[PDB]
Design a protein around this ligand. Structure first.
Ligand SMILES: [K+]
Ligand SMILES: [K+]
Lengths: 194, 293, 359, 67
């Protein structure tokens, strides 16, 4: 009740009437955390299809979802008549052939942040047997634990006024000389007309 | 020039082979079978060397003769043309028989354990993906699919997550359908189960909705997921999807052939009210028959 | 040679009483021995129903996707290759789980025990008192997550009661139940991390993807044969992980003793491509992400950096360094109220200063 | 009498190539027949799952009290 502009409403992602009442025409993000089988991978069947319906009704809307199984991440935004996304299946099979644990990695929705799986937290716990700091680092980045004097994860847009900084190293130099911020990485976007 | 039983050292070579199997293959039960042959070889090879050397004092058996003597012994044939004629040779046969009867069964039980836990083609096939396969659905496909002479060289792979039905099992045991129908327990959503089905080589894939399920939206979601999984794995495989609810029909529009059950059911029921027995007319037309009834 | 059915015939009964005795003894053998055999079969039927440095994995139901995730991550490390895994699960082994365990790679490494952490006998069979670590993982497929969290709290208590000196790695579903397993060495609350990452994705796009790749052990070899330039870079950069090293022992950062944190971070990246993201002073146990320019580095600090390879495991690039053998960063440095949310929903909720409504 | 393991011995191979042939013939017997036996076991396992004037009793579930 103390937070500004936090509202609630009754409905679901499968009810288009409720979604239009929420303001989905004016929504930057639509986060779906909906929870709903004997065959294991079918547990996400309702969430995948419901999200797919909105992907077709609102193609420009940004939908972020959580899936039980990383194998189901290929079904986030499914273009069956798309040779590129169908070729990604061959790439992921090759990576699975070489024994890579990150085979879902090259799926477009995961790479764009549209999907993540909760099985990753399992890997975080197993990693903690070797990296006792890993849980603490993750929560510090997520802001889950707040230590006085510890930084927070943010993002900066590189607009056309900042292209005179040609490379990522020069951006590291400029940030560390003015605001003392440390770049973790880049979120890159390319033109990929489908 | 002293006698040293180097032949018993062959047993240790078998042990050195057992620890080999733990690390590299070169086939899970094949290794124990190979081990079983090894201890059989050690059993025989110890028998030949022991009998040949102990008979060196009496009757002076050759190695080839003792090998034949040993083989007909552990096979319980016991011809008796060549027998141990001295007490230490007779005793060695006794302890070799006893050693055989206490070593071989241990290998047999390890074989039995592996076999128990293990218990739990040509070209131009088609895959049939269902959630539960019943005899009514299977025979309808089999009657229609093999009513054509062109598709007689085809075999059918059934990819179904559920365990094979008892009624379905009996029909598959029939020699007509034994060689034509393979039943795979697996999911279209697991690429490994799609590799076992050879979906990348299948002539066609039939994704059929489950109508017995009380939740038809859930069933339609599963077939949409199955159709996507097959399209993702094998893009150049014609999909034949059976959809229950019309609202879910545009999610599988990419499929080569889609049948919506609710549309056809209610349009035929409505036409029966306009044109009597339109459902009967359509039914006979879509059934392959020679007009001999 | 008689009861073995060899029947050599070199020695034979030559009189009728001896021949009859052999006949009756053969018959007695064939009617007495099978009775012993059937009793043995009866015992065998009902009977059907290692090394050092192992790890116990306590779950309520083990499915293939959970097992392989553990197996891939656990054995991705060369240090943990001599380790074997005990799975303590009340449920009967899954058919899919059985097939993977039959694989020779996992046959000797994984033991599956059907039992409960709440029975000390099942903990003795698991050798929990000797286990290097115990992983208590909640079941998320269960429709009642409060019930599942209660079971993992009980499991964690049972393991702590039986084996106090065994590091507990607990996976908790609901945040309200997280302070009951605070004693555990490492605790992961699923709901906290899930919703914080989902919220960060709304602020920083693909934060969940960034975190996912970092917490996954990889060598950065994915998509290296890809013709696409973005796939090669993306698969390469995914090999980054977070590592820690004492600064004095660190060839990356030892030259920056007495320099500011941001100075070392920029220059170690410019020189070696490593991202100094945080440090832990020797005095405190708190890890600080980007302490800032006023922070002065010292040899006793533990530096946390992002890099493709561990510094010790990067012994090649240092030898590869020997194969070769903008303002500058300085060495030395209605309106809303700002306050804490009054009613914390649960215990353990870290207080974050937030934009708050005046009323 | 050889393949039945009786081995009377009244007629036995008296030269080496026959003794070898009997040895190899026993070996092929012990490696070919079990494969047929195993196939017989599989068929038997999957197989496991009158006069005049009879009467049929059709029920949905038969219990001992009704029978
Ligand atoms: K790495
Ligand atoms: K990584």
């Amino acid at each position: 009740c103390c937070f500004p502009m936090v509202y609630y409403m009754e409905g679901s992602v499968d009810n288009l009437d409720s979604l239009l009442q929420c303001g989905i025409i004016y929504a930057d993000n639509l986060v779906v955390v909906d929870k709903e089988a004997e065959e294991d991978y079918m547990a996400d069947a309702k969430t995948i299809v419901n999200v797919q319906t909105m992907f077709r009704l609102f193609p420009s809307l940004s939908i972020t979802t959580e899936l039980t199984h990383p194998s189901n991440m290929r079904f986030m935004q499914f273009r069956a008549k798309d040779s590129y996304s169908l070729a990604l299946s061959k790439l992921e099979k090759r990576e699975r052939e070489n024994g890579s644990n990150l085979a879902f990695m090259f799926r477009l929705p995961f790479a764009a942040g549209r999907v993540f799986s909760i099985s990753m937290l399992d890997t975080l716990l197993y990693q903690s047997f070797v990296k006792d700091y890993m849980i603490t680092i993750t929560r510090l980045l997520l802001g889950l634990d707040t230590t006085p004097g510890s930084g927070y994860l943010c993002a900066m847009k590189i607009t056309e006024g900042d292209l005179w900084i040609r490379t990522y190293g020069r951006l590291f130099q400029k940030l560390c000389s003015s605001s003392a911020e440390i770049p973790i990485g880049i979120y890159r976007t390319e033109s990929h007309v489908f | 020039n002293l006698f040293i039983p180097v032949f018993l050292n062959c047993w240790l070579a078998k042990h050195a082979l057992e620890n080999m199997i733990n690390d590299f293959h070169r086939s899970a039960m094949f290794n124990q079978v190979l081990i079983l042959f090894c201890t059989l070889l050690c059993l025989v090879f110890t028998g030949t060397c022991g009998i040949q050397h102990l008979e060196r004092a009496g009757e002076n058996l050759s190695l080839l003769t003792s090998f034949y003597f040993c083989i007909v012994t552990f096979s319980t044939v016991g011809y008796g043309d060549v027998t141990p004629k001295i007490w230490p040779s007779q005793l060695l046969v006794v302890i070799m028989i006893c050693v055989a009867l206490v070593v071989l069964p241990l290998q047999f039980e390890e074989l039995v354990y592996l076999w128990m836990e293990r218990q739990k083609q040509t070209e131009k096939h088609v895959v049939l993906c269902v959630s539960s396969l019943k005899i009514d659905l299977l025979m309808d496909f089999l009657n229609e699919f093999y009513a054509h002479p062109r598709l007689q060289d085809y075999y059918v792979v059934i990819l179904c997550p559920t365990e094979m039905d008892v009624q379905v099992r009996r029909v598959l045991q029939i020699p007509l359908w034994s060689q034509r129908v393979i039943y795979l327990q697996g999911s279209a959503l697991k690429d490994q189960d799609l590799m076992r089905a050879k979906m990348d080589n299948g002539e066609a894939c039939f994704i059929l909705s489950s109508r017995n399920e009380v939740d038809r939206t859930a069933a339609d979601h599963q077939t949409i997921l199955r159709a996507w999984a097959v399209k993702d794995f094998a893009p150049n495989c014609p999909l034949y999807v059976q959809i229950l609810k019309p609202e879910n029909k545009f999610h599988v529009k990419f499929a080569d052939h889609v049948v919506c059950e609710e549309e056809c059911k209610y349009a035929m029921l409505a036409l029966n009210c306009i044109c009597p027995a339109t459902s009967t007319l359509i039914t006979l037309l879509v059934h392959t028959s020679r007009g001999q009834e | 040679v008689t009861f073995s059915t060899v029947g050599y015939g070199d020695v034979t009964p030559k009189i009728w009483p001896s021949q009859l005795l052999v006949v009756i003894m053969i018959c007695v053998a064939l009617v007495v021995l099978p009775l012993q055999f059937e009793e043995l079969v009866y015992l065998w039927m009902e009977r059907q129903k290692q090394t050092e440095k192992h790890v116990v994995l306590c779950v309520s139901s083990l499915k293939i996707d959970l097992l392989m995730d553990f197996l891939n991550e656990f054995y991705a490390h060369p240090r943990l290759q001599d380790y074997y895994v005990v799975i303590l699960c009340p449920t009967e082994m899954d058919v899919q789980v059985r097939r993977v365990l039959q694989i020779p790679l996992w046959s000797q490494r994984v033991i599956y025990l059907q039992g409960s952490a709440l029975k000390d006998q099942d903990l003795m069979r698991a050798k929990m008192d000797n286990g290097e670590a115990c992983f208590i993982l909640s079941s998320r497929n269960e429709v009642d997550r409060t019930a599942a969290d209660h079971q993992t709290i009980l499991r964690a208590w049972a393991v702590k009661d039986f084996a106090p000196n065994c590091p507990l790695y607990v996976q908790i579903l609901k945040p309200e139940n997280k302070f009951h397993v605070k004693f555990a060495d490492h605790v992961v609350c699923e709901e906290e991390c899930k919703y914080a990452m989902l919220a960060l994705n709304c602020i920083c796009p693909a934060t969940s993807t960034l975190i996912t790749l970092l917490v996954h052990t990889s060598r950065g070899q994915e998509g290296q044969e890809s013709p696409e330039q973005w796939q090669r870079m993306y698969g390469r950069c995914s090999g980054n992980e977070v590592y820690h090293i004492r600064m004095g022992d660190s060839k990356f950062f030892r030259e920056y003793e007495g320099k500011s944190f941001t100075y070392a971070a920029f220059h170690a990246h410019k020189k070696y491509g490593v991202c100094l993201i945080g440090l832990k002073r020797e005095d405190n146990k708190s890890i600080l992400l980007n302490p800032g320019p006023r922070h002065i580095l010292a040899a006793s600090d533990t530096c946390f950096y992002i890099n493709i390879t561990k510094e010790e495991n990067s012994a090649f690039i240092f030898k590869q360094e020997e194969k070769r053998k903008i303002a500058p960063v300085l060495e030395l440095a209605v309106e809303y109220v700002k306050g804490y949310p009054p009613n914390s929903p649960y215990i353990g909720s870290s207080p974050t200063l937030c934009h708050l409504l005046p009323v």
